[PDB]
Every structure is written in C-alpha cells, then in structure tokens.
Amino acid sequence: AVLLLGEVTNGALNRDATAKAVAAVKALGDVTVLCAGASAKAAAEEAAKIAGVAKVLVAEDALYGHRLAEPTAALIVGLAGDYSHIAAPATTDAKNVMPRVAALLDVMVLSDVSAILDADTFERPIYAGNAIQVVKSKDAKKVFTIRTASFDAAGEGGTAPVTETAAAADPGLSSWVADEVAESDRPELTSARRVVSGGRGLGSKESFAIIEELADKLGAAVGASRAAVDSGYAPNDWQVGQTGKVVAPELYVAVGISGAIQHLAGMKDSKVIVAINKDEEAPIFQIADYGLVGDLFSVVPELTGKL
C-alpha cells in the first residue's frame, strides 16, 4: 500500500501537488491520502475526489496546526506499520517532516524523486540537476518526497473513497508563533503553465512591474532570481532555483537573468525557455530555445504590446 501526505495549507488542500503525487505513486498500490491539520476536513473531501486515491484519512486537531515537524512526524510513523511506501509532494512542509519520519523508522529518505522505476528503484536529480542518479533502496519501507514538477496532476473525477479519522501524540518541543504570508493573487508558481521571471537586470522594485505586466498579459506566474529577492525587488517566495521552487511550465521567459547553475536547477525542465538579456554571452542563451539579445526595458514593453 502507500501512505501519502496530503499537501494542505490553511485548511485548504493544495490539489495540484497532491494530485501530481498520487499520479506519480498510484503505480505502486492503493494510494491512501492523509490530511492532518487544524482544519483538515474540507481538504479530506477534495482529496477523496482525486482519481487514484483508494481512501482518505483525516487528523483534524489543533496539534497539527501548521504541521509542526515533531507532532506530525509522530502521526505518520504511528500509521506507517501498514504501508511499505510513505510519500508526499516535495514541498517545504514535506521536506520538514519526511526526513524526520524516515529516521524514526531508521530508514533512508529519497528526496525529490523524478521517476519511480518500481517498488524500490527510483530516479533523482543530483548536483543541482546536472546528473540523474538511479538508486535502489534496500530499505524495508520507502520514505520519499515526489518532485511534482516531473509528473501530471491526474484527477478531478474520482471514486470518492472513504474518509476516516485518526488519533494523535504530542512531544511538546515546539509551538507556532506567527505567520508572514505573501500576497499571491496570480497563478501559484509551482502550478503555472507559463512563468515570467525577473533577475537583477531590472534594477529596481519599481521596474519589476514591467515583468508583472507581461506576466498578466500571458496569464503567467512571476518568478525571480536570488539577486532580485536579495535586492528587495520581490519576495523570496518567488525564487526559482535549487534553494527555492523548481518549476517546469510550458513557457518560461527569463528576462534579466544570466543563467547561473543554481537558477537553472529549478527551470531547465521547462518545455520552451525564452531569454532576453543584453549580454549575448550570458549562460542562459545556451539552454534557451528562443533568445533575444537586447535591453529588457525596450523589448519587454514591446513584447507585451504585441501580445
């Protein structure tokens, strides 16, 4: 069987991630999604409606509010006994709890699996994506995170399986203090089909708006490089790369980004990459399917106008 950690946030299930995960793992047995949180009920519902989810477990309890690694990891382990595969989408929530879980069961962890060759052979990108390693876990239980950006979010029409309820356990080692949420009113980066990212070439937070205009025009999500975030042009939440989010939309327009290895790591798998830089030698122009060498302050607004 396979226990899968549902990616729920403010009582709202992130269907795209959970879908892609179920889609990736369904070929291993009966997928059973676990929704734990302070408001996991509604999520549980949406979880059940996904094509492939054999059943849904719910753990709605204040103890799981924000899914603190200590309480949550205790939950999963307590249930691990009936599953040989425990997985989840490679999200921060999953990256925080999964390794802890694995250690508790005294088993390794497979991070960012891009391909499941079978019940124990997996594929994962190493060296900031410059190499793909095929590993074989000799472990009794395969604990791992799914690199959602390499699968398709299959679902929407499901068999609406069962929705039970679970227990608890609380090692009082942590508490949530506060949250600083970033206003994102456009396609969430990881799910977007089109992404327009801004780098340092933009010069200011003001000029980043021309990136946003083009994005809206294309109904795309906005991405960013370290430079842009460090200089305050945009929130770190929009960072694409080995440290941030790794996306793979149909269209990825990189304007004002040199194409550093660390940035490519999160977008070299995009279908079509377009680059507009003023430096004809920037590394980005060696991976970009279609590149244009010019001033982003003259090209982007012209591109936006002929769209």
């Binding site: 390794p99 250690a103 949250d179 949420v181 290895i261 279609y290």
Partner: protein, 246 residues
C-alpha cells in the same frame, strides 16, 4: 552552551558536474572542492552567537575523506574553536548518506555535550535536505529548518523559517538542531593571519568505527547518467520574429 557545526567538503558550487559516459558517477577526480555554501552560513551564525555571550565553545565537524581537514581548518579560520574529522570514506567518490552522517553527529553531539546544532539546509551535491531533521529525530530534539533568523533566548529559541508562501516563526526548546537557509546571514572570509592561526587549533582525526557506526549505503546507486541535452535553440532578431516564431 557549546554549538556543533557540521560542514561538508564538496564540489565548488560554480563547477558544472561532469557525468562519466558509463554511469559510474560524477567525475570528481580533478575538480575544485570547497565548503558547502550552506555550511559557511551555519558557521557564521554559530560564531555570531558566541559574540553575544550565548555560546562558549564552537565545535566544527566534518565526515568523509582525509582531505576534509582543509574544510575544517577553513572553519577554524572563520572562528570555530576546534574541529573533529570523522574519516569514513577512502575515496572522494563514496558520498556517505545523511542517515549515516546523522548517527555519527548524534554520537559526536552527545559526547561533546553540545546543546545546539546548526547544519546547512542541504548539501549542494546530494541535494538531500535531510541530515538536520534526521539528526533531531535520532536525538529526540526539536528542529528549526530553513532558518532565516534565530533569536535564541533562554531555554528556547524563536526561529523564523523560510517556508512556502512566506515566513513562519516558531519557538523550540533549547536542545535543538537548526538548519540554515541562504538568507540567514552574510558569512565572513578567513583572513591570512587567522588562517595561519587556525593551523595551530585542535583537529581530532577520528574514524566512523570510533562512534560504532556502520557507514553502509541503504541506497545502492545502480547508475548515474547525464541529463537530457535540449535541442539547439534559435537566437531571433526582433520582437516580431520572436512572437512570429510561435
């Protein structure tokens, strides 16, 4: 308190990994190695804690091959008080798994009496992002991952984390493992006199068996191939030719 800082020796983050044309592994044979970027951040934070009378001693530990010592000395140069080197691999190609590392750090942490551990978010080579958590798990301690700010105060710490969506601040009991995100601080550079001084600081060369730990890989690497080389790429001449090329 004594702070423990795990640092790793891996490829220079600017070097493009070359994959042998026979799935053996990344050809690390003749490449420049350096300290894992996230670890330098870790060290720098530990040192900052010392400069505020929070930490008394700072132990820097690295596990791998003999040459890892160079990385430890770099740590000592930045401000680490002493270092411990756990030799486990006989060749640079044998990367030891986060599970093995965790079990070792756990023994080292217990033996040296460290109450706070500060590891990097992830090792830019295996991209595992798991050691710190596995450590907190094995030790039975709290954990603060992807830290951006660590306000350690009393028998607990207020650490704001870099999470999806924004920032999330939590409070953990003091005996905790913390992992650093690239935004925690700007690491200092070891100056010539301090590098020379660092050469006279302690560095205990130990072995995996000293901690009674089996560095056997739970994951057998069957092969490693080069990623798919994308198809050419055209460099257009005008916005029109761009929008007019589909």
């Amino acid at each position: 308190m004594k702070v423990l800082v795990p640092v790793k020796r891996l490829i220079d983050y600017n070097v493009k990994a070359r994959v042998k044309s026979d799935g053996s592994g990344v050809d690390l044979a003749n490449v420049k190695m350096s300290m894992n970027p996230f670890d330098e951040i870790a060290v720098e934070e530990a040192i900052r804690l010392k400069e505020k009378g929070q930490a008394e001693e700072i132990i820097a530990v690295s596990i791998g091959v003999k040459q890892a010592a160079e990385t430890l000395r770099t740590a000592l140069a930045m401000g680490a008080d002493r270092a411990i080197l756990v030799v486990a691999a006989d060749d640079v190609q044998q990367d030891i798994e986060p599970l093995a590392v965790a079990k070792i750090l756990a023994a080292v942490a217990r033996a040296e009496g460290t109450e706070l551990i500060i590891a990097g978010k992830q090792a830019i080579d295996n991209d595992m992002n798991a050691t710190g958590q596995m450590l907190a798990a094995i030790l039975g301690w709290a954990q603060a991952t992807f830290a951006s700010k660590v306000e350690i105060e009393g028998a607990k710490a207020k650490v704001t984390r870099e999470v999806d969506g924004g920032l999330q601040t939590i409070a953990v009991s003091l005996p905790a493992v913390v992992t650093a995100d690239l935004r925690l601080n700007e690491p200092r550079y070891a100056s010539l006199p301090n590098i020379m001084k660092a050469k006279k600081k302690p560095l205990d060369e130990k072995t995996a068996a000293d901690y009674g730990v089996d560095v056997a890989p739970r994951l057998e690497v069957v092969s490693v191939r080069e990623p798919e080389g994308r198809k050419a790429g055209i460099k257009v001449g005008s916005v029109d030719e761009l929008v007019g090329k589909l």
